[PDB]
RNA sequence: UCCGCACUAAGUUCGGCAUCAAUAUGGUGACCUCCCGGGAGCGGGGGACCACCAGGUUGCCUAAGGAGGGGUGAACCGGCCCA
């Protein structure tokens, strides 16, 4: 139905090790997270000595909580990514890895993003994946030193977020307004770049 | 505050399975094919295909696929230097 996902990553990311700058304490919180929700709704993917690729249909989607699935995905590719970014600096070799990465991970947000197109998804879930998709494919589209696209994504990304801060009250659009600042000066840099 | 309770939500600890490919250059090891010379052992030069290592741009790649470290390397079947 309708969740909050940039409520859920910003209270997670800010109390696993991300507040200081920590990215394997974080990984290692999400992957041990992905790991106990397998667990908990029997979404086994292989069983013993097989394996067998799952997918999240609509049906089951009514749990109202297979949306953090892929979302745990998403973030821990993100968070793999960011953490090459930081070994990047000396080891040359890593960068290849980093990119393949984070094309994955744009992979993921498109599966997450097009799985909430069912009348079983309320409005907002689907507008805020919708912006999260576009912030994540400007990202992408940056670190490739594609500059067309990621102002394209970055420019749809601002103005839904401005859209949906302008949609609550001033109390809750601050972590919107947040997120337009931390925005803005990868926007900027992009346009210096031309 | 007590519960042999129910599920949701985070961590301790121990096993099992698996851990990619294309492109440019150079190198090693098998095999194939062109030559020049010589009274032998052979010497010099050019290519086709396979495997691997280091290492630069990548992906119609996956739930992921480190250019990581170690050991055995066997019966004579990886070669090197070979009494």
Not at 108 to 122: F, G, K, M
Request: aromatic share 10%.
């Amino acid at each position: 139905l309708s969740l909050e996902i940039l409520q859920i990553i910003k209270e997670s990311q800010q109390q696993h090790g991300l507040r200081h700058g920590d990215f394997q304490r974080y990984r290692g919180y999400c992957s041990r997270r992905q790991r106990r929700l397998r667990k908990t709704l029997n979404f086994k993917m292989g069983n013993r000595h097989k394996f067998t690729g799952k997918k999240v249909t609509e049906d089951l989607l009514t749990d109202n909580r297979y949306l953090l699935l892929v979302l745990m995905d998403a973030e821990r590719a993100w968070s793999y990514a960011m953490q090459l970014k930081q070994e990047a600096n000396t080891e040359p070799r890593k960068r290849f890895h980093l990119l393949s990465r984070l094309r994955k991970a744009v992979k993921h947000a498109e599966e997450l993003e097009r799985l909430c197109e069912s009348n079983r998804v309320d409005a907002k879930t689907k507008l805020e994946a919708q912006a999260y998709t576009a912030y994540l494919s400007g990202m992408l589209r940056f670190e490739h030193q594609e500059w067309k696209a990621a102002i394209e994504a970055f420019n749809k990304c601002k103005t839904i977020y401005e859209k949906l801060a302008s949609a609550f009250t001033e109390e809750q659009a601050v972590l919107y307004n947040q997120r337009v600042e931390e925005i803005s000066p990868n926007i900027r840099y992009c346009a210096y770049n031309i």
